[model samples]
Target chain A: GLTIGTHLIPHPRKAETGGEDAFFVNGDDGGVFAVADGVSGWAEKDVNPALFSRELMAHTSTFLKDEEVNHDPQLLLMKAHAATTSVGSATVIIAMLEKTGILKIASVGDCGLKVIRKGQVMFSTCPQEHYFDCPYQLSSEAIGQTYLDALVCTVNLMEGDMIVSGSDGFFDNIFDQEIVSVISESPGVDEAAKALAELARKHSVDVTFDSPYSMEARSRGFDVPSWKKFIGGKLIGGKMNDITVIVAQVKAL
Target chain B: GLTIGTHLIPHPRKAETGGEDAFFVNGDDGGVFAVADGVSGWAEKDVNPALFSRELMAHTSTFLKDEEVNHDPQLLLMKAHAATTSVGSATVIIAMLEKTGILKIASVGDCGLKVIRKGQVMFSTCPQEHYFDCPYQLSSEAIGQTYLDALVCTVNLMEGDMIVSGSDGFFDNIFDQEIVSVISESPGVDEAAKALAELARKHSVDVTFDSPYSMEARSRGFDVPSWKKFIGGKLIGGKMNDITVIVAQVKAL
Candidate 1:
């Protein structure tokens, strides 16, 4: 019942590599969930967003296999923080399944996690910063204090309820309504996931979100040649984001 | 072919300065080793056991350099654990070879290695620990998950063989033939690697099998009547541990 998707694009930053972002969720009772984002600077070939996100999710599976976390999410954060030493910088979000109808979600860094009850933010923790410089992602400090950014949220899942987790890129360009529209236009998880990626690109100024948004936003105001024009020239749906997404049909409570 | 040993007398632990415990093993098949225990609460003078053991064993003639160990073992625990903000802890040992067929040993702690061959014990590790109310040794919890007890074993071997590693007090109180030795006694590869630490008192008296019985063996138990025991009590016997033992001997399988 684990679902996942991903997206990647080249970076425009001086000497940078576009990082990865991904999410996973269990459709059965929404017991376990994960979201990971890679650091964009001096990207190590094997240690970038792909490895970071995947390793963080995998480590969560190994650690939560035994104990059930009740409260004091700081403990989970501490563990996730320790685990980061092996896999370099990256944001992570995970949910552990406890007893029946009980769940624990561990969020490390500023990766976004949102709970939509009838399309409303019942519980949500969004990124506090726009660009890199925010001291919330896994790389803000060394691996030692990454746990300081983790947040754990516990709640039950009901039928037709949806949860979204993604990298800052997704939230940076596309609004919530646009995301809902793309998913709603699709029939299932795979289609919804694909459609979301395509739509994000349609509105994007560059293939990669590594470019400065302020410049792109300012170009629009000055009527200058926009990067979005290049994006449109590439394809009607151009080489879209290294697109990744996840969908869960939450079993009713 | 691997053999380890430990003895607990009465002295103030430190070989040159002030502390307690000493233990070690000399692999019969040309493995020579030793260690030194240091009093954390005392000054920095106690680093002599491990330092001297390695220096002397590596450079000394045939009697001290059997052949198994070629040079001093760079403190593996130092590599494993790291300098903690806190200070002071005892236990250390050395293991190496005097010649192709002989092995020398040294240590300082409660015990060292326990050599078990056909259900019999040969050497033991250290037996150092805190009082009952404080069943944890120096900086145990503070060292985080990296806390490791010091021990070393070497052997001048026979054809069919096994070596047991232990700490001091564990060897002093328990007979060699006693079954149920908890630490590494090398019955099986995994068990040998894991159990070589049996008999020595850990941070807790209830849980025996600590390490580095070199210097401590000279300072603790029957030999020392008070803090000021024999003038060179710690030096008379072996001193220093916190060692690494490599068990190797030429044998026809």
Candidate 2:
């Protein structure tokens, strides 16, 4: 009933580690899709940061077979979280499409889902964070957040609508216009996924570029000075983190 | 922050097998309570009807430690169902109360929950069934219902409001007025549970009395033949089955 194309780019230094982001796309119900970004801080505590997010998405993929919850992203996340057996935490977002053109989503932390209708940004999920870079996350520890903390949303869709969903790194590095224009030019969904991710990948390491993440960091006082925000040395360049993206175009069965 | 009293009476013939009804009450958040009735039809196929329902509830209790979803019944059931492992299926209803006087519920099949305020029935959950005696259920089999099938409800409570909840076997044999009066007189929640269950028990076996179950069955065509329906052979007596009941009275902290 629905189809998906996905791509991921690991942080340069951690490319051999398969990155700290994991995602899945499946044709269940209409279609089920999700992405999870392992909290990089966990690496400092001797835990494999990628394990939790990878396991979370893997369990989520299996749980999508549950039709009762497949259409309800919040409930599905609950099922997946309770089953994840990793030792770290992660930020995640899920999207479920119904054949009738309704899209339901549940998101926690900074992962995003943006709906582009007719080359325009129609809707996008907002980030959930405790502060400037600390996203609310689902963790293996008892103290972490839960699926109930995930923000939920629903939107009506039409044939040919484009969905761009991914981890924060991708959204932070690339602008929505860049995402829309890339999708507008691609003939195949897989090609769109490839081009979109590569663009974000390119921006992530461009030291002189004022990326979305860098500008936000600057606004949030990430600039360097005696009084940081009150002086120069504004944060520039990309947010060099793993990037993962998925592109799904609604179509008739 | 909350207290509960629960009791269940098994069918006379099946009492030795631990009955097919299972329930639990825990003081988590405000309180968490649930009742599950194992489908007796599974017993004929040699599957322990009690296994699924009991496991379903046991898993539910363990999952309640997940505070994030414990406040949300639908999400909690989703977590519980994904963890349940058994060969049979059952109908279940779960009720969760917040410290601020909000009660939320998710129920499937014929389990019932009635709220009594000021000696009157204020609200009651509706039963879900495809046909007479055939209820929607969660099963080990892939084709059964899910938490999404459960009818959800939310209600505000006041100090001294009473909650009476149980399986079809109990609700079908008792009336709202009868339940109100029993809870109305009992000094303790445990005592209220005992007396309420006993009343349903009494009605279940009264062959001469027009029982709720019997009347509904007769109305649903359990009576003999088309000519017999035109004639007389209407099913009499209470619909004999397991009875389970729980009583909880809301109180100020």
Candidate 3:
């Protein structure tokens, strides 16, 4: 009862490794969708952040395959956390559609999930962050403890309702207004997911622009005496991190 | 700078146990307030829900006393869950006012938290439940697993804002409109908390009434042929359980 699409875009600066992002979508009678953004800060000591994300997604795939069709998103994430050993760290968001037509989402860190009904955001997940640039993450050092930061929510969904989720790379660059516009205008979920990731990539490298990330920093009490003075006058563009997106449209039950 | 008051009312049937509800308020520089409702489902041989609640509150008291002021509510709950062991189960809600004048709340189960600003419900925490009657709880059988059910959020606070929280009894008995009306009419936190709990108590035993819980059941696809037939042909009324309320008035930082 759901149609889904996904896109993963590598940051322009690090095109070789395509940054570190992974996603999963199981298109069975009841489906499971998830996205993971590996922490870029832990790119040292022979640690591959992309591998960390792949391990997380791979473990989640096994979880979805082994369990009942409609497992709890939060419990699935916990099982994935226990099964996988991340070399670095990652942030994740998971959504599962039950056979009974209930949609549940679980999230950790800055990744976001939003439900849109007729061009209006009916439900959204709040990010867990210690500060503007610092986010809570699941890592090798903090496995069991970090999972406590996870947030889970469920909302009764209707036919034609659309569920959209992505890593911080997408939200940090694109505003909410742009998201509504793109989703409303797109012909299908595949096009909308690609559009979101592409726009985020375009915004990531714009040095002359006063981007949303800059305004966000200023709002968080960061010093921004002038638009040009922020980020050492390097032009406050979108964060150059891995971008990932998943869009799902609910069908009539 | 917040003025706080609390009231705890035991269920009419279990007056001897004095209710398995506990609350704590620290009037230090940066305020910390919390409420916990021990789950009655675990009331059996040598497993008193009241002691479970007391142990939770006692462990939290030490956590607040030993830690630095302005602690994170999510971290505090995690610490409390680890420090104490219980034969029964409980649900918790914690709020902390940071030195920067931000209000953060973390909660689990049916216990509710609401922030009223200028006679409007600005923010409310959604209850987590497996089903209508079965709520998520931190129990001896599932300590680490239950902690995963916790939800965390942060909202900006302003002067004259009111923060009210209570166990399922308070939320299940009174509607949001009633809560807003009472908080606006009451002069202080102490009066407001007491009046809210007393009103809930009066509604608890009213079998002639069609309550919010009954309506929720109907919305969730439950069979409700009539108001009388909703609860096995018995008059539907507020849940009869221990009631707890904590009201804090936000002041200028």
Candidate 4:
């Protein structure tokens, strides 16, 4: 079984509705947990994107409680997609563990997860996207992506294994190696979840900080032009967005 | 081999863009073609709904020209969905034929098709929906549905076999058997396409007429209330939206 702890921080500009991030951490069905990030662009149209993420997680919780989806994360996402009724879309990822020590994950859009053991990153799920800042998503509209488009994987867990997962904001601002460092300083999953989130937010507001998101941006061919460059400029800095982190430790029941 | 004829008429309130319907009538690759109806709700946000449908069909035409998908209508849609760059969504149905006389069709949303031979519909595709008036759609937003959600079928064609396909408004206005009658009255595919569209338009404005949409509406548990009893009323009349029809006939090369 796994014990879970979570933390969330909306961007400074957005404090209402907790910044459109939603999640569920349950011990039943071995272990079922997940997080979703609402696409904030909906605010431009006067639609509350937070409702989409909240409703989806609300639906996901109901299905898991009914013992549906078994141990399949993809099926969880599928059923939740069918039950969500709202005006917007969000990126989501889910993880389900089996009593036998195997964990499976399914995700759509940019939300991600990483499995760590003995101070090293053992496994991770990458973002599924067409281009920069345009990740796949599940929309309430007929035009949204299907559960079939989800990215999936499986992993075997051991006692003392560490699990980290969160929305794009959490992963984008902090590096993977940096995450292990943050975890090593905390004694418990709850402490680690908060520590990791705070570090990401710490980097997010520092204009001088070079972040994972900015490095990826440069690799994707978006370098700052020499003429417009500044000591602390928008060309490369930690992304300031909603940050959420969920930390779990595999331990005996 | 096959030949095709197409006709389009936008709702009376809209004429410049032909009512948000876009399509291609191609004879290459054993006959590849499709129709897309833009979800008109985008107009509420000041976005031109026609661009989404037209651009999707434009992308479809480009993919078909490149010999992509190889007779798989679902794959064709997937490729076009990836290529489309827009802000709205639309319902799409595609048909692809093989030299061996087999035709495959894939569709999302309320757009429909009919395979007629000997003056009778041998096969037909029903609309895919969760409730009244809402249909499965492909959206430019990350929240839209996928090609995997598309309903698919394959049918064998005979020489002179008649194929009728169109966006939701076309099928919603005209009954299946009524389509056969209109085809019988016409001398050619082009005439049939035009005549059928005209009748649908004729029925669209007549409140006394019983429409396929109205019948389906009641079947879905929406019967008009007694208090709103007017001979000509909004309770039930042909839905006023975009109408587009593609009529194809199998023929020997």
Q: Which candidate is the best by TM-score?
A: 3
User: TM-score of model 4's chain A, to 2 decimals?
Assistant: 0.95
Tens digit of lDDT per residue, candidate 2, span B1-253? Answer: 4568888899998999879999988865588799999999997888999999899899888888897887778788888888888899899999888787768778878898877765555556656677678888988888789986666655566678788999998998986668877887899999999999988999988876567777667655576666654323546677788999989888774
List candidate 2 stretches off by more than 4 Å.
Answer: A227-233, B1-253
- The C-alpha stretches of model 1 lying farther than 4 A from their native spots are A1-19, A22-30, A44-50, A68-74, A96-103, A119-122, A129-135, A139-144, A205-243, B1-253
What level of docking quality does candidate 4 show? incorrect
How much is the TM-score of the A chain of model 1?
0.66
Candidate 1 chain A lDDT trough over 10 residues, lowest sum: A234-243
> Residues A1-253, candidate 1, lDDT per residue (tens digit)?
2333333332223115434654555445325656666665525444455556656656655555436532334465455445754455666666544433334455555555554444333334434333333424565345323554344344444455455666555555555556656656667666665666555555555554423233334423533354556643422212222333444444534
Lowest summed lDDT over 10 consecutive residues: which window, candidate 2 chain B? B225-234
Model 3: lDDT to the true structure: 0.75
Question: In model 2 chain A, which range of ten residues has the least summed lDDT?
Answer: A224-233
Per-residue lDDT for A218 in model 2? 62
How well is each residue in B1-253 modelled by candidate 3, as lDDT tens digits?
Answer: 6788888889997888688988888865677788888887666665777877678778877887655532767677777777777777788888888766667777767788887765556567767666566766776675423554566556556677798898988888888768988998998999999999998888887875566776566545566466446556643557788999999888867
Cα error, residue A221 of model 3, in Å, equals 43
- Kindly report which residue stretches of model 4 are placed more than 4 angstroms away from their true locations once superposed: A226-234, B1-253
Cα lDDT for residue A121, candidate 3: 57
Ranking by lDDT: 2, 4, 3, 1
Q: Please give the range of 10 consecutive residues that has the lowest summed lDDT in model 4 chain B.
A: B225-234
